[PDB]
Design an enzyme around this catalytic site. Structure first.
Site, PDB file in Angstrom:
ATOM      1  N   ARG A 177      -2.632 -17.525   2.345  1.00  0.00           N
ATOM      2  CA  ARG A 177      -2.367 -18.953   2.520  1.00  0.00           C
ATOM      3  C   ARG A 177      -1.394 -19.113   3.708  1.00  0.00           C
ATOM      4  NH1 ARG A 177      -1.893 -17.645  -2.481  1.00  0.00           N
ATOM      5  NH2 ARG A 177       0.386 -17.611  -2.172  1.00  0.00           N
ATOM      6  N   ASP A 242       0.221 -11.305  -4.982  1.00  0.00           N
ATOM      7  CA  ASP A 242      -0.402 -12.608  -4.805  1.00  0.00           C
ATOM      8  C   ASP A 242      -1.642 -12.897  -5.640  1.00  0.00           C
ATOM      9  OD1 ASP A 242      -1.690 -14.820  -2.317  1.00  0.00           O
ATOM     10  OD2 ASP A 242       0.031 -15.195  -3.628  1.00  0.00           O
ATOM     11  N   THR A 243      -1.747 -12.311  -6.828  1.00  0.00           N
ATOM     12  CA  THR A 243      -2.908 -12.594  -7.662  1.00  0.00           C
ATOM     13  C   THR A 243      -2.456 -13.187  -9.009  1.00  0.00           C
ATOM     14  OG1 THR A 243      -3.042 -10.281  -8.457  1.00  0.00           O
ATOM     15  CG2 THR A 243      -4.426 -10.860  -6.512  1.00  0.00           C
ATOM     16  N   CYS A 348     -12.715  -5.708  -9.196  1.00  0.00           N
ATOM     17  CA  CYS A 348     -11.276  -5.508  -9.199  1.00  0.00           C
ATOM     18  C   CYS A 348     -10.824  -4.288 -10.001  1.00  0.00           C
ATOM     19  CB  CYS A 348     -10.616  -6.767  -9.773  1.00  0.00           C
ATOM     20  SG  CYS A 348      -8.814  -6.614  -9.892  1.00  0.00           S
ATOM     21  N   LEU A 349     -10.037  -3.423  -9.372  1.00  0.00           N
ATOM     22  CA  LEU A 349      -9.483  -2.271 -10.085  1.00  0.00           C
ATOM     23  C   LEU A 349      -8.155  -2.605 -10.767  1.00  0.00           C
ATOM     24  CD1 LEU A 349     -10.361   0.498  -7.591  1.00  0.00           C
ATOM     25  CD2 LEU A 349     -11.324   0.245  -9.914  1.00  0.00           C
ATOM     26  N   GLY A 350      -7.571  -3.748 -10.398  1.00  0.00           N
ATOM     27  CA  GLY A 350      -6.320  -4.206 -10.989  1.00  0.00           C
ATOM     28  C   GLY A 350      -6.499  -5.052 -12.239  1.00  0.00           C
TER      29      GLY A 350
HETATM   30  C1  6HE Z   1      -1.853  -4.347  -8.313  1.00  0.00           C
HETATM   31  C2  6HE Z   1      -3.168  -4.345  -8.115  1.00  0.00           C
HETATM   32  C3  6HE Z   1      -4.142  -5.522  -8.351  1.00  0.00           C
HETATM   33  C4  6HE Z   1      -3.959  -6.614  -9.102  1.00  0.00           C
HETATM   34  C5  6HE Z   1      -2.732  -6.978  -9.949  1.00  0.00           C
HETATM   35  C6  6HE Z   1      -5.151  -7.423  -9.019  1.00  0.00           C
HETATM   36  N1  6HE Z   1      -6.056  -6.793  -8.175  1.00  0.00           N
HETATM   37 FE1  6HE Z   1      -7.972  -7.405  -7.809  1.00  0.00          FE
HETATM   38  N2  6HE Z   1      -9.671  -8.220  -7.000  1.00  0.00           N
HETATM   39  C7  6HE Z   1     -10.128  -9.509  -7.175  1.00  0.00           C
HETATM   40  C8  6HE Z   1     -11.404  -9.650  -6.482  1.00  0.00           C
HETATM   41  C9  6HE Z   1     -12.216 -10.953  -6.424  1.00  0.00           C
HETATM   42  C10 6HE Z   1     -11.706  -8.470  -5.902  1.00  0.00           C
HETATM   43  C11 6HE Z   1     -12.967  -8.126  -5.067  1.00  0.00           C
HETATM   44  C12 6HE Z   1     -12.798  -8.620  -3.624  1.00  0.00           C
HETATM   45  C13 6HE Z   1     -14.052  -8.426  -2.795  1.00  0.00           C
HETATM   46  O1  6HE Z   1     -15.146  -8.146  -3.354  1.00  0.00           O
HETATM   47  O2  6HE Z   1     -13.946  -8.563  -1.546  1.00  0.00           O
HETATM   48  C14 6HE Z   1     -10.623  -7.560  -6.238  1.00  0.00           C
HETATM   49  C15 6HE Z   1     -10.557  -6.229  -5.869  1.00  0.00           C
HETATM   50  C16 6HE Z   1      -9.469  -5.409  -6.047  1.00  0.00           C
HETATM   51  C17 6HE Z   1      -9.431  -4.009  -5.696  1.00  0.00           C
HETATM   52  C18 6HE Z   1     -10.586  -3.198  -5.108  1.00  0.00           C
HETATM   53  C19 6HE Z   1      -8.053  -3.520  -6.012  1.00  0.00           C
HETATM   54  C20 6HE Z   1      -7.523  -2.093  -5.799  1.00  0.00           C
HETATM   55  C21 6HE Z   1      -7.359  -4.668  -6.545  1.00  0.00           C
HETATM   56  N3  6HE Z   1      -8.226  -5.752  -6.550  1.00  0.00           N
HETATM   57  C22 6HE Z   1      -6.045  -4.668  -6.950  1.00  0.00           C
HETATM   58  C23 6HE Z   1      -5.462  -5.613  -7.757  1.00  0.00           C
HETATM   59  C24 6HE Z   1      -9.476 -10.491  -7.890  1.00  0.00           C
HETATM   60  C25 6HE Z   1      -8.304 -10.353  -8.596  1.00  0.00           C
HETATM   61  C26 6HE Z   1      -7.753 -11.331  -9.520  1.00  0.00           C
HETATM   62  C27 6HE Z   1      -8.398 -12.698  -9.851  1.00  0.00           C
HETATM   63  C28 6HE Z   1      -6.589 -10.824  -9.993  1.00  0.00           C
HETATM   64  C29 6HE Z   1      -5.594 -11.422 -11.003  1.00  0.00           C
HETATM   65  C30 6HE Z   1      -5.818 -12.529 -11.730  1.00  0.00           C
HETATM   66  C31 6HE Z   1      -6.399  -9.505  -9.396  1.00  0.00           C
HETATM   67  N4  6HE Z   1      -7.468  -9.265  -8.539  1.00  0.00           N
HETATM   68  C32 6HE Z   1      -5.337  -8.646  -9.641  1.00  0.00           C
HETATM   69  C1  LIG Z   2      -9.455 -10.908  -2.433  1.00  0.00           C
HETATM   70  C2  LIG Z   2      -8.303 -10.224  -3.166  1.00  0.00           C
HETATM   71  C3  LIG Z   2      -7.848 -11.058  -4.363  1.00  0.00           C
HETATM   72  C4  LIG Z   2      -8.633  -8.793  -3.589  1.00  0.00           C
HETATM   73  C5  LIG Z   2      -7.263  -8.289  -4.077  1.00  0.00           C
HETATM   74  C6  LIG Z   2      -6.239  -8.977  -3.154  1.00  0.00           C
HETATM   75  C7  LIG Z   2      -7.126  -9.854  -2.262  1.00  0.00           C
HETATM   76  C8  LIG Z   2      -6.385 -10.947  -1.497  1.00  0.00           C
HETATM   77  C9  LIG Z   2      -7.838  -8.844  -1.411  1.00  0.00           C
HETATM   78  O1  LIG Z   2      -7.559  -8.624  -0.092  1.00  0.00           O
HETATM   79  C10 LIG Z   2      -8.873  -8.120  -2.228  1.00  0.00           C
END
Ligand code: 6HE
Ligand SMILES: CC1(C)[C@@H]2CC[C@@]1(C)C(=O)C2
Ligand SMILES: [Cl-]
Ligand SMILES: [K+]
Length: 405
Positions: A177, A242-243, A348-350
């Protein structure tokens, strides 16, 4: 600014949606994006905003495109193009086959076995933060809980000092953002300025923290490079900062406005995991996308190599074609369809960490502060981008109605 319409795009598909400042934002950010699902809007539209790009507006197309990595590549996954070009995090800037070998290392540091290692600390921090707020009868939820809870768990897991949060949170926010003071490339370079010395320190003298584990990791049996480690740690930092931070505020705002739903979870706490899932659908918050690898006709629309397509994860679950009465929150909903955590090879792995943080928050907040509301005369403002959020969430309650555990 509206970019010139490319020669191959017909006028009837033009819908100038601005993902960083949608026109319906005051209604709520999910509501603002859902304008793309009004009956007169095609399944696939072109916006001239943010340099010009496609937007898939329905779950069917969003899912199809996320599955088809041959046509829709993660190489340039962010809008605007300059951001997608600079974006080089691992594994999310890669397609299969290359991508896959890096997932196991990420899974090691933020996946389920790590959630187990952190379980007690997650629980303890939620309880301590909430108990500290409880007697005050008010809080600024974004700054007082939504930020510090997930961010401190992440900084602990990554072995990074809490005093570094303001800087890291600022940089991460410029990638999702942007306030306009920094390009994505500049914010990325600043994040790498931070990470590079720390990665080399921990390759020299490994600890047990996530950065040490990534920096010393193997990828299908060969050593990770310093550069690959940096690019993976960048993704982990953005995910950590930031999630869940944003999602908790959508959920708490909803609960503040819905005493009936609070009472449901207090009376039937066994429903909290299902409530988490339904809130993940309703307050879904991510929208990234892909780049066309070739000319491709998709659902009757001519796409050209190099075109960007936004594939909003947020939109699939809000689509009435996926869930009836999609803006209604029903904790007893039988098939909760969504792509909140993505779809296809980049799931998502998180997400296990995210769900734990959400479920612990719902349980421990309602245990102590069952009765709360939005502050008098406050109008809650949302913000939109790659990850959407809540600008401020002032809450109030009568301390007499609370419980110290
Ligand atoms: C501390 C690590 C962490 C945490 C807390 C999150 N994520 Fe995750 N995340 C999310 C999406 C839509 C995608 C695929 C992006 C793509 O296909 O380009 C990822 C992928 C990922 C991947 C591949 C990783 C390692 C990842 N995200 C670490 C990660 C969404 C989320 C959401 C909605 C949350 C919480 C509500 C979230 N992530 C928490
Ligand atoms: C799209 C996402 C939510 C996913 C985890 C953090 C984010 C901003 C990424 O760059 C991959
Ligand atoms: Cl990935
Ligand atoms: K890129």
């Amino acid at each position: 600014n509206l970019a010139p319409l490319p020669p191959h795009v017909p006028e009837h598909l033009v819908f100038d949606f601005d993902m960083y400042n949608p026109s319906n934002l005051s209604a709520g950010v999910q509501e603002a994006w859902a304008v793309l699902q009004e009956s007169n809007v095609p399944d696939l539209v072109w916006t001239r905003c943010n340099g010009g790009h496609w937007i898939a507006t329905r779950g069917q197309l969003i899912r199809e495109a996320y599955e088809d990595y041959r046509h829709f590549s993660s190489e340039c996954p962010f809008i605007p193009r300059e951001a997608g070009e600079a974006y080089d995090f691992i594994p999310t800037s890669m397609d299969p086959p290359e991508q896959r070998q890096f997932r196991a290392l990420a899974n090691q540091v933020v996946g389920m076995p790590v959630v187990d290692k952190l379980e007690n600390r997650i629980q303890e921090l939620a309880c301590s933060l909430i108990e500290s707020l409880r007697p005050q009868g008010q809080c600024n939820f974004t700054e007082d809980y939504a930020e510090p809870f997930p961010i401190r768990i992440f900084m602990l897991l990554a072995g990074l000092p809490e005093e570094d949060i303001p800087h890291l949170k600022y940089l991460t926010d410029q990638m999702t953002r942007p306030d306009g003071s920094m390009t994505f490339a500049e914010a990325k370079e600043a994040l790498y300025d931070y990470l590079i010395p720390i990665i080399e320190q921990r390759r020299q003298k490994p600890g047990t923290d996530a950065i040490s584990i990534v920096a010393n990791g193997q990828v299908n049996g060969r050593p990770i490079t310093s550069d690959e480690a940096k690019r993976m740690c960048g993704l982990l930092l953005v995910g950590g900062l930031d999630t869940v931070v944003n999602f908790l505020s959508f959920s708490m705002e909803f609960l503040a406005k819905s005493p009936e739903h609070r009472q449901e979870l207090i009376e039937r706490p066994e429903r909290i995991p299902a409530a988490c899932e339904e809130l993940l659908r309703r307050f879904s918050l991510v929208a990234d996308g892909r780049i066309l690898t070739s000319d491709y006709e998709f659902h009757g629309v001519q796409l050209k190599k190099g075109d960007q397509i936004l594939l909003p994860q947020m939109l699939s679950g809000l689509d009435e074609r996926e869930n009836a009465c999609p803006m209604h929150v029903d904790f007893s909903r039988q098939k909760v369809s969504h792509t909140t955590f993505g779809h296809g090879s980049h799931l998502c792995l998180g997400q296990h960490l995210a769900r734990r943080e959400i479920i612990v928050t719902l349980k421990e907040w309602l245990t102590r502060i069952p009765d709360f509301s939005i502050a008098p005369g406050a109008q809650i403002q949302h913000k939109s981008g790659i990850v959407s959020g809540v600008q401020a969430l002032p809450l109030v309650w009568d301390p007499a109605t609370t419980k110290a555990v």
